[model samples]
Target chain A: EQLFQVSFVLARVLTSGIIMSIEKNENELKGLENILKKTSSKQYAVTFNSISGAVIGSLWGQDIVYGEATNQQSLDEQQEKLFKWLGIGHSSLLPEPYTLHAINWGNISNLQKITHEEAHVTLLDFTKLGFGPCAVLLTNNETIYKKSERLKIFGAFDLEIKPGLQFNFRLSPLVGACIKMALIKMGLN
Target chain B: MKTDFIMVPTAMPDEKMINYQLAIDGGEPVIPKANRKTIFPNIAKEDLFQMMISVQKPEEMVVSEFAEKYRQRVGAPYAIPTASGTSSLHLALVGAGVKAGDEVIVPAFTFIATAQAIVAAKAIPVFADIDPQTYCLDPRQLDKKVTARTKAVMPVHVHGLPADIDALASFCRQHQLALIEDASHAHSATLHGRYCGTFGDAAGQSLMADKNFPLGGEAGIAFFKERESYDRALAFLEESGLDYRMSWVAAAFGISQLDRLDYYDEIRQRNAQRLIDELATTRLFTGPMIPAAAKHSFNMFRIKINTALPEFKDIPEYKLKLALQQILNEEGVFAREWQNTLLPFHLPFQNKKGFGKGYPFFLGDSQEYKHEHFPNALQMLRSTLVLCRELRSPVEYEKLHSYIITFKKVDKNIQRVAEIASQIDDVP
Candidate 1:
């Protein structure tokens, strides 16, 4: 019962008696993390499966609750619901706390060129690319990376980490693998 | 649906000549380097096609359909699909009525998230020793950890072998505490013919890794026996301002994987039987002891080095383990320790930085945190090795046979292991 009935190019790549390369196998999430770092020039990358996850990581990674962010970008209903839930209501004129960059097939070829700077963290979203809702919190600050990663411990079932009232904002490794394979076929992985 | 989805191995089975030099010793490895492709999450056509089908639905709808489908399979009355296993445990505790500053008794032997989930629920985790044989929460310690603050008793289905549920449940009832199960390692696992997630007042399971019902993304599902508990989990999520939602990509991918879960488990069980039978032939090795009423899912197969063997008796056990790991890795089995340290032995719990500045830990009575408190867990960690992902999934029998040959090849060199073991100063 497949829809969009078009075959993914990777499927075509799979048609041959293919063999994945011999190398140290890294978790796809971290592989994508490497992609984010190599392509975006950020020192740290924390990924999520949702945009809400990115917003929380962008603000809360800095421990921002009852703190303000700029209202420059369009806010979806569920996203604003999160800000109200966290007591974050920003003034429209405030400076941007973070910049969110969206990536899709059209501009993936120009990844590094488009991810220009400023703000404590750069959130690159891949939800629109049809792999499901995916986001990454990219930053140069190690402290921000640690805290943002901690927020994902609670609901995540991995034997990984700790923290209180934390949300499982982690992305799937499979999704990360899919994204990497997409790049792999494009000669970018 | 064909088993051919798992590709046939191109290389011959491991060369089992005992006199052959190890790859570490400049000998060709049992598994040749040319065919060393990663074999997991094979990314079957079904998994990819499932994602394409999902793009047609509202992502939210995809998540619910997967949850309902999975809940039926799990036989849980209520289910809340979550972002990760840790959050699912938090919600299960919250749903079972755990509140801030409440105490939840858990084994100090499980993944750190078991304790983290308790703290995430704003409940204090009182760590207890594990059953020496089973490596799960020892029910006898439950009475000692319970207090006026104790709200629930959370026992992990450690390594997919169901814990002593009857005794633990009875103790919880006597103390008027709820039973919450950490079934992260218990996909397709059962206790006395009852599935793991069905036994407790609430349960949390991880479908994150391919080894345990892979969702193709990070995902967990919390199960509740009652509607009240399920509602409480949802309510807790809204109040915490958490975005613990599963993407349809993971959800739709889940629908495809669910059908294969039992098939995967069946293969794991059969492979484990082979491993168990083979390990027993090596008098120096043994599998974890399972009670008759429990069925193990074999999420991570544990192999205990029989240090008591005359071949191993005089040597330091840790060195023997390290020497074996070196020998085995060279043979291409890739066997090693999963977690060398106990839960409480880590920095976070030692510092008690729960919710920052020890908000929850400080809320409870002051207590000492130490590693020596759990001797069984210590001994197990020191002497055992685990096969994490590869050996526990639906691997080809040819690969499993190669692994058996690898272990046997190493077993033949026990005297050499002893010789090299005493020289190792690496780890405990």
Candidate 2:
């Protein structure tokens, strides 16, 4: 218990969150699954394989959603938003003065509405893409797109994950070779 | 405290082996049966050269001396010698600002010294996974390892082969990270012809005798791209004063040593090619490929040992070392295994939940150590072994393959030996 108490303080300043993003659309998911099934099959000719791009792609995409989740009007509002998501209703435990001040604090109440609006916008945008409210939402479109393009292999493990839990793998070396094939073909054999 | 440091076998040769090997190589000079090998303290050529080379033979007090003369000729900043390659690595780590608790990214493959030096610096060694093809730190491995605490990235140029230094350097530069190269075996190695050591903020090289350009014994010199780094390195060595400085004696020998390096290295290259040519027919292994962007000096002649073959089961580092030496000894073939474990099995801080799964000082959860990350290292452990210039000559390697009587039969023998050995070897 003593150790746990210490960790509660430590986690506030030091611990970090790791985001795992899952693609939700059935069509795109099916396409990724086919690439994996083909590569694992005898008919598939590609040998280069790695799972890095897809894992990175999904995480970067999620970061964008997380970025757009809070209205940044005041430090109090930011705290409330962060606690609302991270603490998940643990805000009731704040000391009376802190909680009362938070409720009536200047511009704090207005921020509560703004925070709700930010969450609504990001969540709506994510739903439009068929993914649930992301673990964390990121709003940076450029970063999200680049990561998505880099993904070569991905697998989703879930009860309803179709075509029997797809295993996607990338042929990284082949892809690199195709990109540099011209230079290599020109150079020594 | 177990001290739990790296434990090399007593059977393995130390710095002393260099002199014995040198006495054999400088041949055609009347190999008297009596002098078949002058066992230690006989004033060997290297010792004799060291004695005389440093004496500034006065030419109006400006003869410039031998080591300084060599320094002038090669245009390398002042050279320092250490007792061993491991000691020099410690100096380079401190010189690069590796401090206590700072996260230093090191590849999980390669020699133990890669991580040992970081541990010596009181830093947390974050073992980044290696690339499946290159056996160097995968740039893809770094994304999850990066965190606010990461101070440096040490990409060892393993087996004298260059890493993806250009891409890694750019990645490091973008993130404001220090990039250092442990070009321990790479002397003339180059990536895109720019030299392996010049790409990073600083690079360290070991001049151990078996290395491409042998200085005849245990010695290493680190080069810094920036003068500020050089000054700091010199200061750190001077302050530490513990075996970092090369003896003035060895420096004299190393001076003349820098002169004949290219010629000697060329011989090593030819030797490696001959071995490669013969091994192409050996039915089990292939040597590392030289990328168009890389220049290999061929310091160590490594071949993938193909352990996936049913007959090669008991073939990881220590076990393979015993099996190869046993097989080669009976046939009089002189190849040995390179077995220096890179990741320390026990780190003090890794007692927490899932701590071992993800090395401290790296970003993200410990999932980076998942089964998928280490294909090349796994392949190397299961399928690779190397021979340096020590046993690599056209005449020597011609005999090496002739000795491999039956790769499949030898595998059978090794399996039987392992079953008997494993019963008693479970002590650790």
Candidate 3:
């Protein structure tokens, strides 16, 4: 909560329109899923943002759009789509900010399938769902670890995310891997 | 606490503008820009006689004197001058007792020479990812990459930016792995009041073209902390069947280069910081991020372009990178995407069969390696842009001003660049 609070203040100064407060329930998840379902067109832009307000990069929804609302995609294609997404052309106007660390998708299910179980087990301090209007449920099962210890366990989790759940974890190299694999597994790959 | 800041593009300097025309506009380049000289091998009239004495007498081998001076300056017990940086690294590995069937973990993001040296030592080169901020090997990944057979870790002080050698040293000590610093790009660069080469058991430096301290060309120096390592390196050089000794002429040049190294480092630091300060407003690029504990030599000014910024949304990163580079090159700026691929993906190392069969990979219990293990290395390659010049004079700042102006102009007309790239893409 302290980390989130600090990041909220940091993010607020760099840019506007980010929802900085955390939600108490899974309502944000449902809210996000509804946004995806109600979309009139399939095309979208999946932007990744760091907790500290930097826009890490973006992914084009169109490149991964195939099959019945979801399709399995290659890790290569998932990353390729992201590498293609550009920054919001006007970063110069804002003050220097920290670089982005995680990707957020318009499709909530895909996001959940990527970050689910590992978020609870490995990323106790790595809370997801901020910088946008998304919701997540919190549990007292958080396990605090040192920076080095967390880094050692990073990306060490197996790929077995539960469907329909929202992800919340600290950004790590492994989280990046899970995000790509999740998007791909949801047929957005 | 909250603060407000302004980000504005650099305007023309108030300093008296040079009357020279920019090369882009069909005028002559600025003074230092137009004139290129090799200052390292500066054998003026005064050094000619000293050069003759060094060349003629074995008792007065300037090479030995030069090596001792370097060792003292770098605070090491021993120094070995070699034929080149590659040979220095090879010899350092040999000195570390890295033999056949051993593995040396190296950063995948650096020059291929870092990997080739390990191979030359008859040891396997295990690739690790880099810290995106420093562009050096990430110490976090050190634990994951080390195997039972791994004997050494070679961290490069890339572009004169010191790697987090402290963390690397601790990690190596805990694992009982020897640490080696590739100080080829970091001659005088320091971290926490210590020079780069002194952090490891043994380290290598290159006195080659474009480096902070060049001995004209093809000259290298190695530093050893222990007497045994120094003796072992000497033995290896003698028995390797390769001529690895530095010549008297090159050693003389090295001595002169070392004499002026502090002056050159100061000039480079001043110019690089000025450029970075002015460009901070553009958001066109971010970093050569220097850690608080490190003093950078600015041997290579590297930054990641704002490829993810909103204005570039419609453009592919490669296309945008190419467009930006073309604009820089056209304007007489030396801009290029260097080391665009990681070591595992390089053709020389990618071949598992190694010429005929599994030679390097299968030989000495080496396992197959992959690029996917090192993600930060991949992310950095897609975003990096480097300024190829080392500004060493006050007059050179005027050229640097031109470069800043050119960057601003290109950024101002970036839409035009997109249009041109689009046209090229649509060509039948």
Candidate 4:
């Protein structure tokens, strides 16, 4: 008790932040939170967003910043975040339609708002911002193969498709991902 | 005996009208003398010379010259300047790297020039079917026609309506195929703020005399966004014959005509609207319902007609086609089946002596067996006939309406035709 006055308020704030970090789906972040709770020791938390951004940035020879509190992040970082969390970005949207990445991590704020409107706005904004996907995805729900082509024709405000969605890593994987999103949204499981 | 409009007395603009008098009374000549000589072939020499100066910018005569004059008038950045609509298409394909033996998908319902351009590029033409709604090449039908051999897809924006460029572009990208646009009719058209020419790697436009942007002769131009493509297009001009080059005279003409495009296009829109209003009262064929993003240049107004139903089930498509033309002739309107005869109209280009016997249906038995063969093209070729709806001063429109009404005033044998429609499946 060498002048280490009890700081319950500080401890509360620290614990809340730790919990917030753990809520995110990241192996390192969860591990760090668990270690701190179980062993009462300092630990490191690495989130999918930060790590994925860093990895993608490095691969593209871009400057990597780890949770740096700067608004002007690099395109590489944003691109990584897109691929990591399935957020819409340029590298993911162009050339051909494909599910280059799974967009499981749109802004948490959107979960409460209008999903359809948000999705549409997000798509237009991403494409306009030079972060649009290149490919489109065509689903074969209608037995007549021509129906798929019709949807592509009439619903042309969207993306083009790649030869294969999963195989192309260099090209944007997020283009033509609407059909895939539909599958997931419709409980394709 | 001549009850039809072809024999009716049409009202011409009276020279005595106040508007005409005002312009003439003033320094301006309402009926310019110089215009009389060239514009009206039968006008007196003295009258033509007087009108010529008033008409203004008759310097362009040929298609190429007129195109240039049009361009100058409009202030376009550049123009392809070719001899014909087909030439523009060929140049576009060649510039875009469409080589011999490459397969190009085209609409079966369109004019032969659409296919002829493909063939001239040394590419094989794979005809696709049209959708019933827009009467343009249907994207739904396009999917069934795509094959491994198809290197590109060309949808003719029929009757001034835009085809699904977004889908076609995406599909091409998905399959790693090239995308080109045939904007022969989409002058002043825009889809989602993107012009038809901008949607694909390249696009071609025909500046024919009858087109909305009427350049007297048959000249066409192709547009491209990429610099490399621009260079390639120049190279194509050099390789193709002299007629392929858009002459300086044509460029000058296009400049002038392009300037007045808005004015003429307005007239077309008005004409189309008027016909649409009048046709609303009719019971038969429908008028152009100008689609969104369509400038709807009233290039050619067309409608559907039916003669016999169930009884004609066993009749050949070509025969039905001829019969429809004959019927239109009887009604004092010229109608004919739409075929890519222009592509195969010539002996050397096509193996057949006359025109090819039928529409290019997907021959499943041939070496080019792909799951995406087009049955709709063959079906449409057999069932439909193309007509110039407003020709002979909109008599075509009135006659068509009358024909439809008369047909619906069906005879005791009407049930027979209804039976045929019953047997025809897969149509909306």
Candidate 5:
């Protein structure tokens, strides 16, 4: 009944205990971001609590406000409602707000292989891959990335940035560590 | 599941309280390792087994299932799982119909997150004073802070003690304001035969690893009493594009942990009461003043220094605190002022920055978020030291006795305590 599967999971979950790893949270999130930058086409990415948050982070502050839609993409009901509530209309002919890839075991091995160049931002949901619900908004533009950052923390903890409303759409770092570990476990380095 | 101990001593002889050669000076420490190896959310074999089973379950089901179970446990009609306490508070406000730039009155004595969540909801947090005794938002202060733009009232259950929920509820009803309980530290706490969270229109709680009820790593939940408010929260997410979903990993972990919540809760409660009883033997230290009307969760314990007593009044209050903290540390315990600065004095609110454009301030008819003395909160912060996360571990009799004995040892050496206080200059 004893197995590496149980030992590996507990090592990440219970070893340090999430309470003790709070200081480690900041570092692991940055580490995840740095790895993503090297692994992806985008120069930067911001982690969100969920895919929908990443979706909004990708398109918000980029003229994707109320009464706009894209012919290039069809969205699920939740995504459609998200736009509708933002006052954006769903239409048939325009570029979609953003592109996303839900990363998991199915495509993660090939993940060494994936990008949207034209769109201002993109979404990467690592929800199924392991750890927990996490989605990242990817961007090459510093402006978009910064906006994503601001939305998560008021003023983005930046002395330079003007005051802005920020939600705690924060991704926990222990989960980030878990995902990082998941990558190693599955990828088998 | 009988409570481990209830025959706590009502009072002890003054001799023991003053007997020891103080650990701070010449005396041997009460317990060589007086600080027990205290840990909460301890990883058990059950959690390990659950994690293995969680691998095959749908994350969506696990998260949703946990929400339903928790909702029932909390006796709330609806629940929305969240990534953290702040997000849950944001959802609670939204569910209660809080709008951008709307004024939401909160206690000055609470954690920074209590006020920060109001900002996340795009609402203004109007600071109110705390009751000097309960150390929670004073319902009496609401009239001064309330305005026509006021949309809600969020009162925190400070340090696991339920605030004056009935008084606050009546006030909210009179003012037509929403009552949102920030039950982040009050898990399993009750007032007047009902749970703390159930008394309000909506509530939020943190299940982070450090809390009385912890998830795998980080998580929170928002509760709404009515379907309309719950739907409003759901639509708020849709329109706002804010994804505050709880991680299935944390949710699955919570499902298993919830089973043992009562187990840990009983022991901690027993420990707290025993410790509280032991404090009666000391001259300076006193446990939190919990009302008979409410049951404490003991998430974190705050002890008040009896600076009014002859033994302590002579020394500067702050100086005495530093002296006490040093000696207590030597005795294998920790003592600290949990938060020194009032919420309004913190830079985030002090300068009053909002979502750019001076938004919450700019939202036409906003009051200046200026620095407030909030005399009561200021007084409490100076006089009290919090035993955060230190007292939460469900300890056995031996460790609990060490804690009890350590306080007595510290209390016994009043002359040394005075000497130590007189010696210190820098308060921090």
Candidate 6:
């Protein structure tokens, strides 16, 4: 599968990352997971740290991933996953912290032991290491930090995934719509 | 005996101590000025839309029904519904036996429409001075302005406050001059148990915006006491080749509004009373002077500041009033000056010229009518400040108490206010 970079800007959060192509074999996937655990995990915690710095909260020990994995995934595909998770038809109807879409990341492993002290360090490091869109799905209803600045990079971010939540690999019919409008408004697709 | 407030040095309310956040500093207004369009006629959209879609023949127009209902309500035997208040007043002048080359005495202090209506009938409008107390036509000065050409006296019940119509009616009857009550401001207003529009030979009531009987839009009703006169006026309307008849849509709105006229009037009365009561103790402003016999349906309330009084003595009367008006407006009180010019000083009146060379005022005769001195009317216009009071709810009325407090604060700091006034180049 071809790897594509996706980004999202949600109401109060932003995320961006390079898609982990499903074409990778099981051995390659396991090796990439280990690399994510060591490198990207620390940066994900750093981004979470910026959020916790303002208010009292934690994004640790949660299912953090991009929406679902796809080969030729577009912004609409990412938005579909978000609106379904939000239980809303339109993203505008979603309240703060989950409305705007910035970046899109496919499924990823969680960093249980990682803390948010230098999440920025990992964020920059990932982008340097060929991860053009460093998208991460954050859990725990805490707000995104430096939202104004971060929104410029990622298109939008929405959705909080619980560990046991079921995903049937299907888009919400109500949310399955033209990405032109949200893309045109944000100057991104 | 004079109460010495100057020597007593009335305890001033400190401006610094006042909470500016409540009104002065761009905060929420105390007495919120409501949108008038939202309240009047109080009709549902569905009913109005239904009326629009329904087919109607010319004979089925409800204009006559509205006119008849208005006539019955005002205890008149004849009423002609017209397109506007000025038109209705013109109809009344014609109905009351006024003709061309005749002069009708009208209050110098009223809306120009009163004079314009007389002019519209090809009759010269003789501007009479108003009584200072009532701000209506001065009955005492009626004989002085009366000429052999004088055919009528149109007394305006200004601001929903009844003119001394009883005295004027008696005056008109004794002289055989027609008495036409310009009751445009006085809708359902009574004096001594008699409705205002019924006090004369014929009366004209307005159902225009800002008046007590706003009929969704502009309209007028002419009321008369006799059948022959009504028919004559109707004939003139038909012959004049003017479409003066009220529209069915407008009549429908008026009919609906007329039903709640008394209810709205009561609310206005209560709001005015509450405001008057709240400001009773303040020495700076004097409340409206309502007569015991006359029930004032206050469509607009007048506030007269004692400019000659000690506290305001330092500032010029005009400057002081202007400064006070500014403070009230800044403090969220919708206060303003009365009309700047009296009837005589208006551009047309000043020129003494109309469609023809002095057509209304001058006939083939050499002597043209002149309007020179109207002391009481001048004084009333100069001294008075007008405040609108319409459809304010009881809850809204409570907010007016803040205005009283604001006025007290301004009064206590008059010296500072005067200093602020001094910065402007034009003092007067």
lDDT of each: 0.74, 0.44, 0.54, 0.42, 0.74, 0.53
**Per-candidate DockQ vs. reference:** 0.25, 0.01, 0.01, 0.01, 0.26, 0.01
- lDDT score for residue B348 of model 2: 24
lDDT of 1 by residue, A95-143 (tens): 5557777788887777767664655688887877776667888899887
Per-residue CA lDDT of model 6 for A94-164, tens digit only, reads 22222112322221222232322333322211111111112222232233322221221111221021111
- Name the TM-score of candidate 5: 0.83
Off by over 4 Å in 4: A1-189, B1-78, B143-149, B193-195, B239-243, B247-253, B277-281, B288-290, B306-333, B340-375, B378-428
For model 3, chain A alone compared with the true chain A gives a TM-score of: 0.19
Q: Runs in model 3 with CA error above 4 Å?
A: A1-189, B1-53, B352-359, B364-371, B390-395, B421-428
lDDT of 3 by residue, A97-139 (tens): 1112233434434443433332221111112322211112221
DockQ of 2: 0.01
Give one digit per residue, the lDDT tens place, for model 1 in B203-263. 9887775446777556789999999999998887776656677767668768988877777
DockQ of 3: 0.01
Tens-digit lDDT string for candidate 3 (B1-428) = 32222133223443322333334445443223333321222223433334334444452267688888888988987888765676688778889777865889898888766776776666678888788788898888877778888899999998888998889888889989888889988878888888889988888876653466655334678888888998998886555434455544446546666776776677677878877787777757665788999988777778778777666767766676666666566555667866767877765575542312333456655446666788787777666778654342222455567766656555555556565545446322
Off by over 4 Å in 6: A1-189, B1-60, B364-372, B389-395, B402-405
Q: Residues B1-428, candidate 4: write the lDDT tens digits.
A: 11111234223323333122122113232223322111100112222232222123332234345444544543334456554566677777777777756778776567656665675564667666567656666777666767767778887887667777777778888877777778787776667755556666667787654455543223467765566766777775444322244322223334455555565566556656665665455333345555565555555665443434445555544554554444334333345654533222222223311111211212121333232344554455455554433321223233334433322222222343344334444422
Cα error of candidate 4 at position B51, Å: 14
lDDT at A103 for candidate 6?
A: 28
Encode model 6's per-residue lDDT on B165-261: one tens digit a residue.
7798888888889988899888877899778877777877766644677653446788887877788798775555443555444465566566676
Clashes of each: 10, 13, 15, 77, 10, 35
Model 4's TM-score against the true structure: 0.48
TM, chain A, every candidate: 0.74, 0.17, 0.19, 0.16, 0.78, 0.22
True contacts kept of each: 0.29, 0.00, 0.00, 0.00, 0.31, 0.00
Q: Model 3 Cα displacement at A140 (Å)?
A: 78
Chain B alone, candidate 3, TM-score of 0.86
